[PDB]
Short mmCIF file of N, CA and C and ligand atoms in Angstrom, two decimals:
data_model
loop_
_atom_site.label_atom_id
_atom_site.label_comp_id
_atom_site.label_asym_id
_atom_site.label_seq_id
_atom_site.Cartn_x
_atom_site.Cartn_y
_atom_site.Cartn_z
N UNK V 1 -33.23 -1.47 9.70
CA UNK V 1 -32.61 -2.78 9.56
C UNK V 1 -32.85 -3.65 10.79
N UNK V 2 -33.43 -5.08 10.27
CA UNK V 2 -33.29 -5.74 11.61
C UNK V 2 -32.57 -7.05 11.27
N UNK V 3 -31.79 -7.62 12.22
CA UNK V 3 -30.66 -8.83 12.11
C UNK V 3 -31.44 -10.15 13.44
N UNK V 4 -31.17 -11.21 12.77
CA UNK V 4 -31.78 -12.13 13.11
C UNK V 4 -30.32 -13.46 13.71
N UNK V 5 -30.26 -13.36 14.79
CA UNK V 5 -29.67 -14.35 15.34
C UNK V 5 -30.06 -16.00 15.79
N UNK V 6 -30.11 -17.09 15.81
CA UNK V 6 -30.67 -18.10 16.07
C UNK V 6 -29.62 -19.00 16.75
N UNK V 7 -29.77 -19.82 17.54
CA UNK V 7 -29.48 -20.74 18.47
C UNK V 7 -30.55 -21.92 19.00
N UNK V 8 -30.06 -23.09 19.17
CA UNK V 8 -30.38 -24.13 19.89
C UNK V 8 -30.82 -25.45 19.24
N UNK V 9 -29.78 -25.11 18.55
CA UNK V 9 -30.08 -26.50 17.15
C UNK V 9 -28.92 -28.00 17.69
N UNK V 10 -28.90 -29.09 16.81
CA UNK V 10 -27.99 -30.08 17.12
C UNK V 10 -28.30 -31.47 16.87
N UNK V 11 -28.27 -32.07 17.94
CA UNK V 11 -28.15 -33.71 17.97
C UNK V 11 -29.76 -34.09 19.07
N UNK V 12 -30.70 -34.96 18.51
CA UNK V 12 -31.18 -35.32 19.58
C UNK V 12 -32.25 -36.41 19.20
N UNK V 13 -32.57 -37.22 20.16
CA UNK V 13 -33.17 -38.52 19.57
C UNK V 13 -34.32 -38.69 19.73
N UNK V 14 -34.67 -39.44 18.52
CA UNK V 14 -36.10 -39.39 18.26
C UNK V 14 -37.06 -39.48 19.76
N UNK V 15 -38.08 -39.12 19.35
CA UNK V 15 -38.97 -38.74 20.34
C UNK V 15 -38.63 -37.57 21.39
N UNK V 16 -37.39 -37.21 21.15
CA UNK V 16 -36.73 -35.81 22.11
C UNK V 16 -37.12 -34.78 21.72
N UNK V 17 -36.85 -33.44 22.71
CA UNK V 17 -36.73 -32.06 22.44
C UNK V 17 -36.14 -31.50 22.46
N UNK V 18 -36.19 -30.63 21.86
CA UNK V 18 -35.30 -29.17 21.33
C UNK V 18 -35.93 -27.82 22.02
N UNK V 19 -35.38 -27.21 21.88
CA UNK V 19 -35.74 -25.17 21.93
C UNK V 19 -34.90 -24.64 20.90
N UNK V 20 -35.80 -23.79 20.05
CA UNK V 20 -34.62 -22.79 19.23
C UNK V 20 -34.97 -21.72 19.83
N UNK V 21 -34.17 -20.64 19.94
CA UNK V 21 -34.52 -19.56 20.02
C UNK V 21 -34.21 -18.50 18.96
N UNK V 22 -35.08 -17.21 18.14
CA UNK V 22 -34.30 -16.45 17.54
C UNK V 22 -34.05 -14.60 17.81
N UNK V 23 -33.23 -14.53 18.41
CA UNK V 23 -33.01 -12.98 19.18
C UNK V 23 -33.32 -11.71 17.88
N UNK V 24 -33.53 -11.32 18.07
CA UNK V 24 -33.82 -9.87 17.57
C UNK V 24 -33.24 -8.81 17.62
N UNK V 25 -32.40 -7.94 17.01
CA UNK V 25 -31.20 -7.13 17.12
C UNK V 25 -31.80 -5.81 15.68
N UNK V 26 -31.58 -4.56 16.36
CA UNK V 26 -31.46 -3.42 15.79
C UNK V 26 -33.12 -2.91 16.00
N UNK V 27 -33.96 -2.50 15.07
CA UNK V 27 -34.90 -1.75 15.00
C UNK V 27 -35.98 -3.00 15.14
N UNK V 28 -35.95 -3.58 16.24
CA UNK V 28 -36.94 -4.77 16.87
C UNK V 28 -38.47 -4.20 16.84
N UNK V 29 -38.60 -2.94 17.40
CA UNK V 29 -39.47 -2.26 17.90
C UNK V 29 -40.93 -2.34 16.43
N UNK V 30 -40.00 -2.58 15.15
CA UNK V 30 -40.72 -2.22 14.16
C UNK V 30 -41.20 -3.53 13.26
N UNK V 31 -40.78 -4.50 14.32
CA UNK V 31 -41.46 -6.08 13.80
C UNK V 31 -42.56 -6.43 13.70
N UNK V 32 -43.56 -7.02 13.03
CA UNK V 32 -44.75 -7.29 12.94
C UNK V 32 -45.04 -8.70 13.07
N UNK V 33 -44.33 -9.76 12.84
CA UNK V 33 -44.99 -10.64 12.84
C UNK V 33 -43.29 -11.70 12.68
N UNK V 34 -42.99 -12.93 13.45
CA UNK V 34 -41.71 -13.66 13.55
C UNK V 34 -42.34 -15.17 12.91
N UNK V 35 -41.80 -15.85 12.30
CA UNK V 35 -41.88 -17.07 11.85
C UNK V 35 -40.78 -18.48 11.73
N UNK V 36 -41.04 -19.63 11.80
CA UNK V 36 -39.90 -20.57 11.98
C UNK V 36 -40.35 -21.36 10.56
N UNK V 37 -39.38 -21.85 9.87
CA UNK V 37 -39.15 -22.54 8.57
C UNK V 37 -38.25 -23.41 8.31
N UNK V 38 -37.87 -24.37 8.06
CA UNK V 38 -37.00 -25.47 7.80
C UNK V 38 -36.54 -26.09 6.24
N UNK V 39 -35.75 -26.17 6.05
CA UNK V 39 -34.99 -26.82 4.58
C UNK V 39 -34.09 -27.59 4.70
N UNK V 40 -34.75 -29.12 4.28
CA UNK V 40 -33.75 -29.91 4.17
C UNK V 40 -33.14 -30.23 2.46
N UNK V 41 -32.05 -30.70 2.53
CA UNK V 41 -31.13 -30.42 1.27
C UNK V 41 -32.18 -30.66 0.18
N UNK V 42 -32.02 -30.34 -0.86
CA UNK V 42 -32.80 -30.56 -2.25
C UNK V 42 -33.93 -30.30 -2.23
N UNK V 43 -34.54 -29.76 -0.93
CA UNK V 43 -35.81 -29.28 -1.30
C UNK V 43 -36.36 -27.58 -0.86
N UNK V 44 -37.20 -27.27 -1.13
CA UNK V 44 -38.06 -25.95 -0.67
C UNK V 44 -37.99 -25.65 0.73
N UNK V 45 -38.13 -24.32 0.84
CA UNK V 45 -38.56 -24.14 2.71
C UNK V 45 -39.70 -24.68 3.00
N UNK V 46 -39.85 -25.36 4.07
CA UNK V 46 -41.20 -25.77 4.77
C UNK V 46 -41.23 -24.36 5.61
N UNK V 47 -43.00 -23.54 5.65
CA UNK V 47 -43.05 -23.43 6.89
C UNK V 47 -43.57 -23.78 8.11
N UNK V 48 -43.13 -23.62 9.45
CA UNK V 48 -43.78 -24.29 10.29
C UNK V 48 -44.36 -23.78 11.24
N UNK V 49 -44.38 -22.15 11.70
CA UNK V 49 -45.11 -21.56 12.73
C UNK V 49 -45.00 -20.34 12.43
N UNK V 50 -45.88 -19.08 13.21
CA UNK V 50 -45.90 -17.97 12.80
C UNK V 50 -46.81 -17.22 14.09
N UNK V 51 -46.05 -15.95 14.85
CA UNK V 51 -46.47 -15.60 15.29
C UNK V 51 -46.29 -13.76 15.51
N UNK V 52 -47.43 -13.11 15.90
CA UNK V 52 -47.71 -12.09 15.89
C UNK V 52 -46.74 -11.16 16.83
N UNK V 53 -47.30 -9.71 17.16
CA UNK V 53 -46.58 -9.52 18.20
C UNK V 53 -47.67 -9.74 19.23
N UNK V 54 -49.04 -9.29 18.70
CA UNK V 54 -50.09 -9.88 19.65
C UNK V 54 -50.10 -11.09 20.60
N UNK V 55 -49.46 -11.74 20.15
CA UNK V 55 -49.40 -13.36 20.70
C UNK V 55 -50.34 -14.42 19.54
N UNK V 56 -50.99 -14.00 18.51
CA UNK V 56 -51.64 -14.72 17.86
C UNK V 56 -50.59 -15.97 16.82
N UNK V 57 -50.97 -17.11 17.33
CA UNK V 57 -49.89 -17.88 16.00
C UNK V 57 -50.90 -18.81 15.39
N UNK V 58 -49.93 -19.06 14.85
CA UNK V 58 -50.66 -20.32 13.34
C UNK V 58 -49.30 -21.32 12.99
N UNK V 59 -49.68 -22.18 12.35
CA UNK V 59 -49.01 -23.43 12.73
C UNK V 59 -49.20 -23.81 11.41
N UNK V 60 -47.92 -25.07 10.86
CA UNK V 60 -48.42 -25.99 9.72
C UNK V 60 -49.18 -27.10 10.13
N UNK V 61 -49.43 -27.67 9.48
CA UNK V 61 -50.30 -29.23 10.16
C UNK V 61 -49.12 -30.35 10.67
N UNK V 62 -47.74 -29.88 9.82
CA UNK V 62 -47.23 -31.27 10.24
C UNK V 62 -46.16 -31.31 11.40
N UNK V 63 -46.48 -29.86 12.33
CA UNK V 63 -46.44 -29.94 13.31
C UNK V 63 -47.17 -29.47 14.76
N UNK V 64 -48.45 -29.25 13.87
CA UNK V 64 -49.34 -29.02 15.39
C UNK V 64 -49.85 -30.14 16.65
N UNK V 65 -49.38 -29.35 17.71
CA UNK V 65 -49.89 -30.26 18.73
C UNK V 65 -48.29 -30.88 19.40
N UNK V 66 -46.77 -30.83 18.52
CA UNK V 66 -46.07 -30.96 18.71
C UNK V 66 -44.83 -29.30 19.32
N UNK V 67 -44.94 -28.47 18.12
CA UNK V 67 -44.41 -27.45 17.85
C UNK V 67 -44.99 -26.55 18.56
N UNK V 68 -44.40 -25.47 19.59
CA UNK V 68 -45.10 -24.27 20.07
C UNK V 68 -44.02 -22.97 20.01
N UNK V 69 -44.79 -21.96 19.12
CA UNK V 69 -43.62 -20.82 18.86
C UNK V 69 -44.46 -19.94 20.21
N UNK V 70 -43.90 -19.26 20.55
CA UNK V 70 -43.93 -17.86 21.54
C UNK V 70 -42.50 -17.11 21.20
N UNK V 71 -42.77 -15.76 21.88
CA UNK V 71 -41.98 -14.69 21.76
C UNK V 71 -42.16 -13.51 23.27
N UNK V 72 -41.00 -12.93 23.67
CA UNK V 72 -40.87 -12.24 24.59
C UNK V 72 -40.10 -11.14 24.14
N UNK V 73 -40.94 -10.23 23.90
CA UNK V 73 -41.22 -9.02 23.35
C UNK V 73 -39.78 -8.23 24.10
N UNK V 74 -39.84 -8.22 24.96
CA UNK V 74 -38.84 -7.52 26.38
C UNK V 74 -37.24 -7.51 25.54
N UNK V 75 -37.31 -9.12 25.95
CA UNK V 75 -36.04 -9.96 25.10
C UNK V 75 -35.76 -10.11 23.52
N UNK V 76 -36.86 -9.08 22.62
CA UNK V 76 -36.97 -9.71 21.07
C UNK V 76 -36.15 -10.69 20.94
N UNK V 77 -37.32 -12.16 21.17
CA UNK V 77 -36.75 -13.28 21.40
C UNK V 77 -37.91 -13.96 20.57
N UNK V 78 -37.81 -14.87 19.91
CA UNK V 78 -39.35 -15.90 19.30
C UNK V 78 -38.49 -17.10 19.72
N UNK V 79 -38.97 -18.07 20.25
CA UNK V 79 -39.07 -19.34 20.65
C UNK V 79 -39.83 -20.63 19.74
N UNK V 80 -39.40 -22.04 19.01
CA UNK V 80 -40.20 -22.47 18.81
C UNK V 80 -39.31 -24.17 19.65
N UNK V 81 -40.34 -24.28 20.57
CA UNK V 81 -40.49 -25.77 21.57
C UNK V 81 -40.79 -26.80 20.65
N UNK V 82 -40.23 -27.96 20.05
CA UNK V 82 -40.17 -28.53 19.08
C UNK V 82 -39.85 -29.82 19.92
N UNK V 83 -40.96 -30.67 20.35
CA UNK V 83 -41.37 -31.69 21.16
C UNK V 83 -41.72 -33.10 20.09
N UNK V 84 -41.45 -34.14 20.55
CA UNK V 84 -41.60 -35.74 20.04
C UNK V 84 -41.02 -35.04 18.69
N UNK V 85 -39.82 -34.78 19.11
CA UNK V 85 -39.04 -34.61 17.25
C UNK V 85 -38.91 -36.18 16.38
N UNK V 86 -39.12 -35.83 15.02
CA UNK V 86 -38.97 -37.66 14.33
C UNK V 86 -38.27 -37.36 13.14
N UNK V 87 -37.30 -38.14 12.99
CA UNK V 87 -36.20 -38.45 12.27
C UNK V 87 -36.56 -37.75 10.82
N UNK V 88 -37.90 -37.40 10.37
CA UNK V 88 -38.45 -36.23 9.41
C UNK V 88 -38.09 -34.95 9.77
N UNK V 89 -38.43 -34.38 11.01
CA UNK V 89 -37.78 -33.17 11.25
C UNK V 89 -36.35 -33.05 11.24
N UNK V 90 -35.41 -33.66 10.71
CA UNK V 90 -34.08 -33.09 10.29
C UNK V 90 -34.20 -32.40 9.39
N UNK V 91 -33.41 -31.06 9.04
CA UNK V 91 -33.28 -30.14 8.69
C UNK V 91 -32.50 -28.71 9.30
N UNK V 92 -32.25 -27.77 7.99
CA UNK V 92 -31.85 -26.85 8.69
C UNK V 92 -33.05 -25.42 9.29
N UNK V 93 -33.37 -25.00 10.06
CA UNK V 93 -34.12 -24.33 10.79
C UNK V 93 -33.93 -22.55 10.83
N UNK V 94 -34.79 -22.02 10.06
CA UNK V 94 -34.67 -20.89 10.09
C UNK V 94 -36.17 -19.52 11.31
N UNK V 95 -35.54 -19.10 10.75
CA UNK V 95 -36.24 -18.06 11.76
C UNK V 95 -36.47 -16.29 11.11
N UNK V 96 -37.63 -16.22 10.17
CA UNK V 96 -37.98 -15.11 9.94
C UNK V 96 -38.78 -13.84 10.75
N UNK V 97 -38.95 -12.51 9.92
CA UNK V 97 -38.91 -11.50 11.10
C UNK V 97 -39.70 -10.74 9.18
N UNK V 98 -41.04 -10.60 9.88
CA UNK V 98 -41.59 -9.26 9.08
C UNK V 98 -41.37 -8.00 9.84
N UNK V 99 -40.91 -6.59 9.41
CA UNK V 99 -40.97 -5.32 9.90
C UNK V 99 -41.24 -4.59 8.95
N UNK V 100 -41.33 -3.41 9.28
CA UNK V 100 -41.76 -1.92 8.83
C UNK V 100 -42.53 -1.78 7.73
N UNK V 101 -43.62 -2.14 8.67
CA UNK V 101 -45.23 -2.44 8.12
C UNK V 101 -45.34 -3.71 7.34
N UNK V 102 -44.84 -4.28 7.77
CA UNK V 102 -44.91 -5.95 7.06
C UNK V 102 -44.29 -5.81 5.89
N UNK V 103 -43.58 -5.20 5.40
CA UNK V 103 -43.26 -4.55 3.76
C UNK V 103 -41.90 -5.18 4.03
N UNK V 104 -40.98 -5.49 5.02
CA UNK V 104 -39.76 -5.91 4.89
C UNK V 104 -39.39 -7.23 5.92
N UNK V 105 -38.48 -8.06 5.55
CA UNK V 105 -38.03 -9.32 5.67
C UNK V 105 -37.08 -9.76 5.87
N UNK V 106 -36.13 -10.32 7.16
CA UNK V 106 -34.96 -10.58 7.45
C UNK V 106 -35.01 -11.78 8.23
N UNK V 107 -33.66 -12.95 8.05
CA UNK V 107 -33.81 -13.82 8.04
C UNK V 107 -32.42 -14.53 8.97
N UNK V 108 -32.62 -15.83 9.84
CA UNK V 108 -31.59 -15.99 10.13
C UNK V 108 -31.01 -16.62 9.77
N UNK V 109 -29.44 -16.89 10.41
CA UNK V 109 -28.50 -17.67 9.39
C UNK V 109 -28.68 -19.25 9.49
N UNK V 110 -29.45 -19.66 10.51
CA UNK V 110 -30.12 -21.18 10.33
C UNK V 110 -28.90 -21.81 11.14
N UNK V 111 -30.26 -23.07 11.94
CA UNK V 111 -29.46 -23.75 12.60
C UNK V 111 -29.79 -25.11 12.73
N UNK V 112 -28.23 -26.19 11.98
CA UNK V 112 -29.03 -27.75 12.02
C UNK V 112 -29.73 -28.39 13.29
N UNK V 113 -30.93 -28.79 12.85
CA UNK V 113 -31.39 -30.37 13.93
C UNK V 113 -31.16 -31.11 12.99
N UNK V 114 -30.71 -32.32 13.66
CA UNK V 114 -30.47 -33.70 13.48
C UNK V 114 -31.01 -34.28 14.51
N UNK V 115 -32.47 -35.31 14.21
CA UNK V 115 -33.18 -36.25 14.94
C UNK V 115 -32.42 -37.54 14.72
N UNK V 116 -31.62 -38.12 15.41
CA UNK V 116 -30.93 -39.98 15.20
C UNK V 116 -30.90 -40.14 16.25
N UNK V 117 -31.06 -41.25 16.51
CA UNK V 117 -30.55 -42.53 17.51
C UNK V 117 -29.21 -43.05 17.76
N UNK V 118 -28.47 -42.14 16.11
CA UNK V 118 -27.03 -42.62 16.49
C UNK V 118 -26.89 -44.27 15.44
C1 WYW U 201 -37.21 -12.27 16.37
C2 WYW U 201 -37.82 -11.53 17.49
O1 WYW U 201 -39.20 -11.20 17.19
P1 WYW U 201 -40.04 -10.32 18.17
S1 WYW U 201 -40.20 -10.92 19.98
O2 WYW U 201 -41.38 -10.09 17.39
C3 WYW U 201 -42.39 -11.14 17.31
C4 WYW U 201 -43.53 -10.70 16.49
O3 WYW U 201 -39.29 -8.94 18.02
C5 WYW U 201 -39.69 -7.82 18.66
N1 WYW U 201 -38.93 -7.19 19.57
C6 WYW U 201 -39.62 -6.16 20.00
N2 WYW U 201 -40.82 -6.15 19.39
C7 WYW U 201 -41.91 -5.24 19.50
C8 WYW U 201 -42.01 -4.42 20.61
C9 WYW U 201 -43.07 -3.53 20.70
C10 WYW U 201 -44.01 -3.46 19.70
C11 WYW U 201 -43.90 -4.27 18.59
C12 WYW U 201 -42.85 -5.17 18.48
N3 WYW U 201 -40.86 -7.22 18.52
NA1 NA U 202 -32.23 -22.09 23.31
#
């Protein structure tokens, strides 16, 4: 079993940044691959980054060049740096976790951004 914690969601204005982070708890050791995804009301998950334990990631288009996931293995921690946020990226923000042999899937409990000016 692995449990997925997330933090660093909220309020912040356009053109600002964020950090989420999502911690990693129980049988970490047996993760293969961490990912970040977003759903705003009435629609589907977007996803938006994906990275290995290698360090290899991949990205959606509609946030490359903005969005950077990393992870610190030490800390089972995945990170995604979510830079010139725009009033589109509101949503709620999740944080997936493939393990034991990519065959299984756990997810976190999600955390709002809200991009406004107020
Ligand atoms: C949500 C946290 O995800 P991460 S940092 O995994 C990102 C892919 O979890 C994690 N923690 C320890 N891990 C590990 C250690 C040794 C060998 C293989 C994996 N992987
Ligand atoms: Na954080």
């Amino acid at each position: 079993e692995v449990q997925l914690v997330e933090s660093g969601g909220g309020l912040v204005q356009p053109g600002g940044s964020l950090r989420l982070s999502c911690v990693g708890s129980g049988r970490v050791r047996t993760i293969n691959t961490a990912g970040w995804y977003r759903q705003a009301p009435g629609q589907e998950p977007e996803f938006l980054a994906r990275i290995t334990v290698g360090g290899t990631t991949s990205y959606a288009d509609s946030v490359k060049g903005r969005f950077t996931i990393s992870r610190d293995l030490a800390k089972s921690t995945v990170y995604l740096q979510m830079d010139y946020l725009k009033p589109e990226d509101t949503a709620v923000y999740y944080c997936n976790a493939d393990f034991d042999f990519g065959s299984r899937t756990a997810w976190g409990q999600g955390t709002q951004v809200t991009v406004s000016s107020g």
